[PDB]
Structure formats: C-alpha cells, structure tokens
Design a protein around this ligand. Structure first.
Ligand SMILES: Nc1ncnc2c1ncn2[C@@H]1O[C@H](CSCC[C@H](N)C(=O)O)[C@@H](O)[C@H]1O
Lengths: 130, 416, 40
C-alpha cells in the first residue's frame, strides 16, 4: 500500500496494531502507533486497543511497558482500562507497576477510589512490614 | 508612509461592573437584534495556559444553594423576611428556577443591589426567548408535541406558584416584587435562561450553587466553545478563560458550553434556543438498515471515542461539510461493528438507500420545508421572539435530517 | 489523591560481639599512641 503511493486508512492501521498485540509483538505495535502519528491520525484509540490485546493474550509485562509509555506521553486511558491494569498487576504481585499506573491515573484527572486502594493493599499486606 | 495610506453595547454596561471590579480583557460587549454577546476586541494569541478573559466578583452575583437548606451567597435576604418563606416552600428538585426568580425579583427591589442596575440590560418580556413567555400559538409552531407539553407544564407550575404566594393577603413588601403574573413569569424566564450552576468553594465550604452571574450570562452557547468558566476560590472571582492553546481572532464571539451532552429540545426547554449543529441531537430510526460505524467515522474524519467524537479539521483541508450534525449523525444512525470486519459495498448501499428513504419520510411529516421556514423568518415583521424561536427549532431539525441524507450520500460514494 | 508514600526507619540495638569484630576487620593490642623518636 505504501509502495503504491496510497495512504492507509486509520482503520487499516488499527487492524495491524490489534493483530500485533494478539501475537504479543509490542515492538511492532509501537512502530505502527508511531506511523499513525506520522500519518497525523489520532493514536489514542489505537493505543487503547494495543494494551487490551496484550493483557488479554497474557502479555501483562509487555502491556505495562506500552501503557506507561502512552500514559507518561500524555494520553489519558479509559476508566475501564485503568481498572483493568491496576487489578491485573495486583493479582500478579506487581505492586511496582500498579502503583506507577495509579499515580498516572490521578495525574490525568481520575482519582483513585476504594477499589484501586484495595488492589494495592492486597499486595502490601503480604510484604511483612505492616 | 502613514500619511499616504452588531453595535457596541451601552458604554455604561461595562462601566457599572468596572467600578465594582469587573474586568474584561481583550473582549467587548456588542448588541444586536438577537441580543447581547461577547466578542474578541483583538487577536487573542494562544498561550501555554488558558487566558483570563473576564473576571466577575462574587458580590455582584445572585447565588443560592442547589441543595437544601437554601442559603444565599452573598446573603442578601434579611432574617425574618417573608421572601425566605416563599423560597423555602418550593420543591427542592424541580423549583430551583422559582427560588432564583424570587431572589431576582427581591434583588431588583433593593436600592444597593447591583442587579438593580444590571437588570436594565436583561431582555424584556417581549425580547426573552424563553418558552415560558410563549403563547399557545407560538407553541403551535414547534411541531413537537413532547416539547409543547413540557412547556405547558412549566407555564402551569410557574403560574400556580405566583397565585399561591402572591395572593391578596401577602405583605406589601411581597406584592411589590411581582405585581402581576407576567412579572413573575419573566423573572422565572430570566432564571432559567441565565442560571449558571457550578461547584464552588467559598472559604472552607464547598457546595453546588445556582448562580446569576452578570457579564458572564452574556456569553452565548456553543458546543465547540472557545471559553470556559472557572471559579477562583481565593478571591471569590468567577473567571472566563479561553481554551489553552486556542487562537481567537478579532471579532470572534466568545462562547461557553451551557449544557454538555444535551439535545435541542433540552436547549429549547431551558434556554429557549436550538442549534442546527447540535452533536447530541437524535433521530428515531427503525434499526432495520445499518451502516458501518467505522467506515462512516473514517470517511468524515471523526475520531475519538463515541462520547468524545470530534472532527479532525486538519485531515479534511476545506471540507466544510463535517460539523456537529455529522457527529450527531454518527451517534444517532443505526450502526454495526464487528471489530475489523470490512463492509460489503453493495450491502451498504442498500442500507444507505433505506436510511435515506426513512429520512425523507420524516421530512414529509412537516407541512413546510427548511427553506420555506427560512424565508418565513426573513419575511417576518411583527413576530414575537418565541414565534421565531419556535420556527428556528423546527427548521434546525429539518436541517439536521437533511444533513443526514447528504452525509449518507457522501459516505456511500466514498466507500469505493 | 494517593499520598507519595515514603517509608524510612532507623533502629538502634545492642550489638553482638560478632558485629563488633565485623566492624573492625583490627585488634588494638598496645597502649602506645605515637612514637617519641619517629613521631609516627
Ligand atoms: N447559540 C445560541 N443560538 C441562539 N441563541 C442563543 C445562543 N446562545 C445563547 N442564546 C440566547 O441567549 C440566551 C442566554 S443569556 C446569553 C446572552 C443573551 N443574549 C442576553 O441578552 O443576556 C438564551 O436565552 C438564548 O436565547
């Protein structure tokens, strides 16, 4: 398509980004997101799709790397994805990532509730330091 | 060499606020046949942060708590005044406009109150576009039985409140506020069309207020505003701030979003106006025929999530077609989506054709068209403000349905 | 909001003879301070 001089549709890039996440290819998914920015598209929706695919396909470690890059880059995630990332990290014993995200969630403008605190506490209660 | 090379409002309009610490920066108040407005008096260059456009001190406002108990900020009603009993007898949920109207009429009676002066720049009974002032013949031009019944209930509720509380036995200090029902109806119309509800912190007390804010109730509505309101708790000043990073040209109108997410029938019930580019307006489709949501959004460069749909105006160049109506079309059209399944063009044409037929069936319900309504407005010479408002409302809905037929035609061809 | 948590502690305790040795290694065995001739 690029070699033919045609401009890929925003939906076309989203199909490739979602496919990359299903295989756990976070590097390719991030390369395609960079192309969408270069094509002047809106990468917020495609970034959201990439993170949920990695979480769904048990690539939580890769999902955290992609999510934090978008969140630190200024993008604001959806409330459902915020609750997904915090909960999945705390179920896996990853307090460091779950605390990083919840700090970014509040910086965006979404204040943590009892649900998010209960996720962090589930890991803090097992560290041996009350 | 230099040798060889909408009317401004009353100058006293800004001055009465200015001597009481109202500040306006780079904007001017201009008056036209349709009313007051706020316009950029110069090119407002973008900055890293929101620019202060107007500052309105708290003491010039009329505010009441949204939630019971009714406290007034600033407190202007004396202890024991019979007006508090009238305010206190209202329904806490529905009668916020009656409470504000009583405060407004009470404020006009006070010699020292600012709204004694500011009230002279409020629209009169024959100039306010509120449907509370509409006659039964004006409601006949709406062509919306649901909205008409809503207005009739509002007019009945407002009138019954006046008859109950302004009977013959009330004190003179109450009678002189609303000597006639039309005076009280006008006050409720001012309350509905101009009330600004915000969460404020005053001192240490955070509460929701219904506020009558002078000079900020001159900002017109836009669903793509270039300004927003911001309460500054430390000095009790309402700020009108232009959007951060947004360049505003000289003469551009300064607008705020009165009612995010609200349809034109809600804008008509509250503020007595409607917009043809309302991005939340809906149209009842059968759902038998559906188009591809992803394709429709990408054809018109509508990006974002459904609740934050916006037009990437830099991806169209000069396509003036896409506006709030097409965004409203995306939200109201029957759509299907299957993650990344593409749509068959021949099956989408059948849906587009059937959707266009259903759009024309609804236009045929209206006795006149949107062009015939537009020339009716131009031909008016002795029409009430609400009559023209009622005609603009039905024309806007026709313009919206007509935009959907145009958008579907473009979408069907751009799918090749 | 979430507090910026900061967990720092200091504790004092009586010290074992083993910890005393681990500090030094290192045994001072002579009562001499400085040589008279070499001043070393
Ligand atoms: N976008 C818009 N289109 C048509 N009328 C509008 C409008 N925004 C505001 N108005 C009018 O302005 C009123 C709100 S008060 C805003 C200023 C007003 N013109 C005045 O003289 O005080 C509404 O009743 C409505 O009639």
């Amino acid at each position: 398509e690029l070699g033919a001089g045609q401009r890929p549709l925003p939906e076309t890039m989203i199909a490739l980004v979602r496919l990359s996440g299903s295989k756990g290819n976070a590097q390719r998914g991030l390369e395609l997101l960079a192309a969408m920015e270069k094509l002047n598209y809106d990468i917020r929706q495609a970034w959201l799709i990439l993170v949920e695919e990695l979480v769904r396909t048990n690539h939580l470690e890769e999902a955290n790397k992609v999510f934090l890059k978008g969140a630190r880059g200024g993008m604001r995630a959806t409330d459902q994805l915020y609750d997904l990332m915090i909960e999945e990290d705390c179920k896996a014993g990853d307090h460091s990532n779950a605390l990083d995200i919840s700090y970014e969630m509040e910086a965006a403008g979404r204040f943590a509730t009892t649900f998010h605190f209960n996720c962090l506490l589930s890991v803090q209660a097992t560290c041996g330091i009350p | 060499f230099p040798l060889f090379q909408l009317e401004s409002a009353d100058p006293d309009f800004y001055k009465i606020g200015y001597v009481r610490r109202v500040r306006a920066y780079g904007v001017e108040f201009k008056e036209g046949p349709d009313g007051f407005g706020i316009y950029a008096s110069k090119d407002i260059e973008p900055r890293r942060r929101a620019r202060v456009i107007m500052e309105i001190p708290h003491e010039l406002m009329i505010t009441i708590r949204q939630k019971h108990p009714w406290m007034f900020f600033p407190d202007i009603v004396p202890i024991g005044h019979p007006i508090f009993d009238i305010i206190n007898s209202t329904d806490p949920e529905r009668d916020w406009d009656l409470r504000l109207a009583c405060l407004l009429l009470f404020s006009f009676d006070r010699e020292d109150h600012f709204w004694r002066l500011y009230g002279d720049f409020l629209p009169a009974a024959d100039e306010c576009s509120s449907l509370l002032l509409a006659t039964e013949e004006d409601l006949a031009e709406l062509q919306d039985p649901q909205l008409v019944s809503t207005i009739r209930q509002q007019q009945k509720r407002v009138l019954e409140f006046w008859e109950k509380n302004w009977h013959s036995g009330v004190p003179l200090k109450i009678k002189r506020l609303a000597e006639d029902a039309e005076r009280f109806i006008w006050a409720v119309s001012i309350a509905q069309t101009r009330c600004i509800s915000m969460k404020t912190r005053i001192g240490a007390l955070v509460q929701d207020l219904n506020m009558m804010i002078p000079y900020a109730d001159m900002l017109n509505h836009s669903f793509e505003p270039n300004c927003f309101l911001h309460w500054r708790p430390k000095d009790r000043i309402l700020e009108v701030m232009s959007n951060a990073g947004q360049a505003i040209k000289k003469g551009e109108e300064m607008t705020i979003n009165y009612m995010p997410g609200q349809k034109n029938n809600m804008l008509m019930e509250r503020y007595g106006f409607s917009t043809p580019v309302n991005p939340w307006d809906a149209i009842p489709f059968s759902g038998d025929s559906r188009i591809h949501l992803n394709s429709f959004l990408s054809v018109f460069n509508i990006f974002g999530l459904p609740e934050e749909y916006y037009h990437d105006s830099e991806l169209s160049g000069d396509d003036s077609f896409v506006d709030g109506a097409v965004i409203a079309a995306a939200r109201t059209l029957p759509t299907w989506s299957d993650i990344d399944l593409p749509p068959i063009p021949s099956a989408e044409r059948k849906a587009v054709k059937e959707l266009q037929d259903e759009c024309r069936k609804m236009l045929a319900e209206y006795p006149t068209t949107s062009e015939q309504d537009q020339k009716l407005l131009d031909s008016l010479s002795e029409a009430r403000t609400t009559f023209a408002t009622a005609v603009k409302y039905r024309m806007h809905r026709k313009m919206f349905i007509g935009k959907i037929i145009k958008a579907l035609d473009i979408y069907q061809e751009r799918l090749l | 909001m979430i507090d910026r948590y900061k967990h720092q502690q200091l504790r004092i305790g009586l010290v074992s003879p083993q910890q005393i040795s681990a500090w030094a290694t290192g045994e001072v065995t002579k009562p001499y301070t400085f040589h008279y001739k070499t001043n070393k």
